[PDB]
């Protein structure tokens, strides 16, 4: 009863803080002040909060549909997180995010420099996750930290379902890692450390391939430990396509900045590998992840035989939104990896990144359902 009350409290403190944020942005902002670094820094936090909210909705749908998402994840049958707790955590982090944004927008609050407010938020999140005091969701935080350890260094780690799931979720949430690297550079060699104005009126390729690299080496490991080349080397190639696409984007940008003559051939390679990568991940999503387009569909054409969710319109809406937002994700991870689009730049990424988490939230239902009804991942 108190958890539901806290969910309601946070959902509404966050609402009024959002209204205040909109009013301050349309009123308090001093016209030309180069807001872009601020929104780029806070985009990671906003994406994390949205991902937590969408994952709460995911747990809600999983519980209603009758799936054993506490068994596939190998979670304990008791003392796991329901949708209420995820909503509460999301609301608390959103409250902190809004308070930090309002403090940044309101300089006359104190004489303390504004640029400390972002870290005080993000560091808090780390301090929230690094909580050895066994106070707040200690089992959940311990499980998450163990998963992060077994994911971020996972050549020498047998891959269970949770490892693969978080590794896949990293690709769609990689905007946070990109923004982290950008803010590290911004604090290193952009701001002056003297003026109290945080607005300030090829590594990128590696960092963006990092989630792809983790899932690549995790599927290579799965093949090594299983000997089934088809279900795993295919995914290895799927993320190799991401490697090639990011590499060709970087080469194209470098050669265009240098005025290199042969940059058009690099553009052609980039576009062909973009088509290849997008189609590859899309066909894997539809055919293997969700398990749709099964030849034994019958009356459930374009879907599979066994359907758990009530309405079939959800599946078709998801198919269309997937075939659109997967192209969106590929174009976004190609643009933000380099200086591909100087004009749009952060605008298209800021529009698409929130949608990549939505696409992954939608994909979570069907991946969990496909793995539940028939053990698609071979995790047994």
Residues 159-188 that bind ligand PC1 (CB under 6 A): 173, 176-177, 180
Q: Following DSSP, what letter does each residue of 214-250 receive, concatenated?
A: HHHHHHHHHHHHH--HHHHHHHHHHHHHHHHHHHHHH
Question: Alpha-carbon distance 249 to 18, whole Å?
Answer: 37
Burial of residue 57 (CB within 10 Å: 0-12, 13-18, 19+) is: middle
Q: Does 118 bind ligand PC1 (CB under 6 A)?
A: no
Looking at 24, 35, 75, 99, which residue binds ligand PC1 (CB under 6 A)? Answer: 75
* Angle at alpha carbon of residue 327, lines to 296 and 348, rounded to 5°: 150
Both tokens of 119, joined, read 């870290």
Tell whether residue 213 is a contact of ligand PC1 (CB under 6 A): no
**Whose CB is nearest to ligand PC1?**
80
Kindly compute the dihedral angle of the four CA atoms of residues 66, 56, 7, 138, in this order, to the nearest 10 degrees: 100
Give the residue, chosen from 21, 41, 89, 335, that forms a contact with ligand PC1 under the rule CB under 6 A.
Answer: 89
Stretch that binds ligand PC1, among 8-16, 108-116, 310-318, 322-330 (CB under 6 A): 8-16
1 binds a second copy (CB under 8 A): yes
SS3 373: helix
Contact partners, residue 100, CB within 8 Å, separation at least 6:
42, 45, 117, 118, 120, 121
Q: How far is the CB of 54 from a second copy (least distance, A)?
A: 18
Among the listed ranges 10-18, 34-42, 232-240, 271-279, the one in contact with a second copy (CB under 8 A) is 10-18
Q: Identify the residue whose tokens are 């047994």.
A: 380
Is residue 81 close enough to count as binding ligand PC1 by CB under 6 A?
yes
Query: According to the binding rule CB under 8 A, does residue 10 interact with a second copy?
Result: yes
Query: Is 20 one of the binding residues for a second copy (CB under 8 A)?
Result: yes
The partner in contact with residue 50, picked from a second copy, ligand PC1, none with C-beta cut-offs of 5 to 8 angstroms by kind, is: ligand PC1
User: Rounded to 5, what percent of the chain is helix, strand, coil?
Assistant: 75, 0, 25
Report residue 100 CA to chain centroid gap: 22
Count of residues in contact with ligand PC1, rule CB under 6 A: 47
Report which of 258, 263, 233 is spatially closest to residue 248, judged by C-alpha positions. Answer: 263
Smaller CB distance to ligand PC1: residue 75 or 236? Answer: 75
Position 9 contacts a second copy (CB under 8 A): yes
Residue 65 main-chain phi, psi, to 5 deg: -70, -20
- Establish whether 359 is an annotated binding residue: yes
The CA-atom distances, in angstroms, between 372 and each of 6, 163, 218, 310, 376 are: 32, 16, 21, 16, 8
Assess 29 for contact with a second copy (CB under 8 A).
no
Query: By CB under 8 A, is residue 7 in contact with a second copy?
Result: yes
User: Distance (Å, rounded) from C-alpha 229 to C-alpha 163?
Assistant: 20
Q: How far is the CB of 97 from ligand PC1 (least distance, A)?
A: 9
C-beta of 87 vs 243, nearer to ligand PC1: 87
Q: What, of a second copy, ligand PC1, none, does residue 20 touch, CB below 5 to 8 Å by kind?
A: a second copy
Alpha helix (H) ranges present in the chain? Answer: 2-27, 36-65, 69-72, 83-105, 116-129, 138-152, 161-172, 174-189, 203-226, 229-257, 263-284, 313-335, 346-373
- Could you tell me which stretch among 13-21, 136-144, 329-337, 346-354 binds a second copy (CB under 8 A)? 13-21
128 binds, among ligand PC1, a second copy, none (CB under 5 to 8 A by kind): ligand PC1
To the nearest whole angstrom, how small is the minimum distance from the Cβ of residue 201 to ligand PC1? 26
Which SS3 state, helix, strand or coil, does residue 259 take?
coil
CB of 361 to ligand PC1, least distance (A): 10
Please give the Cα distance from 240 to 349 (Å, whole number): 22
Say whether residue 206 binds ligand PC1 (CB under 6 A): no
Among 107, 125, 234, 288, binds ligand PC1 (CB under 6 A): 125
Residue with smaller CB distance to a second copy, 3 or 344: 3
Determine the distance from the C-alpha atom of residue 207 to the mean position of all C-alpha atoms in its chain, rounded to a whole number.
14
Q: Does the protein bind ligand PC1 through residue 143 (CB under 6 A)?
A: yes
Binding residues for phosphate: 168, 171, 238-239, 326, 359-360
Q: Which residues are near a second copy by CB under 8 A?
A: 1, 4-13, 15-17, 20
């Amino acid at each position: 009863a108190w958890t539901t009350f806290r969910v309601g409290l946070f959902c509404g403190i966050f609402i009024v803080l959002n209204i205040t944020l909109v009013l301050a942005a349309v009123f308090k902002l001093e016209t030309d002040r180069s807001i872009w670094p601020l929104i780029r820094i806070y985009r990671g936090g906003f994406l994390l909060i949205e991902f937590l909210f969408l994952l709460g909705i995911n747990t809600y749908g999983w519980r209603q549909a009758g799936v054993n998402h506490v068994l596939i994840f190998e979670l304990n049958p008791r003392s796991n997180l329901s949708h209420q707790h995820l909503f509460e955590i999301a609301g608390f982090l959103g409250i902190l995010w809004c308070l930090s944004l309002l403090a940044c927008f309101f300089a006359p609050i104190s004489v303390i420099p504004t640029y400390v407010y972002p870290l005080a938020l993000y560091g808090f999140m780390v301090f929230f996750l690094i909580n050895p005091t066994k106070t707040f969701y200690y089992k959940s935080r311990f499980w998450l930290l163990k998963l992060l350890f077994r994911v971020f260094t996972a050549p020498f780690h047998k891959v269970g379902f949770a490892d693969f799931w978080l590794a896949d979720q990293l690709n769609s949430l990689s905007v946070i890692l990109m923004d982290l690297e950008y803010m590290i550079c911004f604090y290193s060699l952009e701001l002056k450390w003297d003026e109290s104005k945080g607005l300030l009126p090829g590594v990128r390729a590696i960092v963006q391939c990092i989630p792809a690299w983790l899932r690549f080496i995790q599927c290579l490991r799965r093949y090594r430990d299983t000997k089934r080349a088809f279900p795993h080397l295919v995914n290895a190639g799927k993320y190799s396509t991401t490697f090639f696409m990011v590499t060709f984007a970087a080469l194209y940008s470098t050669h265009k900045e240098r005025g290199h003559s042969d940059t058009m051939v690099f553009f052609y390679l980039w576009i062909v590998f973009y088509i290849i990568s997008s189609c590859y991940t899309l066909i894997w999503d539809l055919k293997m992840d969700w398990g749709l387009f099964d030849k034994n569909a019958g009356e459930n054409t374009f879907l599979r035989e066994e359907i758990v969710y009530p309405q079939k319109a959800y599946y078709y809406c998801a198919i269309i939104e997937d075939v659109i937002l997967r192209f969106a994700w590929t174009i976004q991870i190609s643009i933000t990896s380099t200086t591909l689009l100087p004009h749009s730049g952060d605008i298209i990424a800021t529009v698409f990144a929130p949608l990549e988490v939505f696409r992954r939230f939608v994909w979570n239902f069907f991946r969990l359902e496909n793995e539940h009804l028939n053990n698609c991942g071979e995790f047994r």
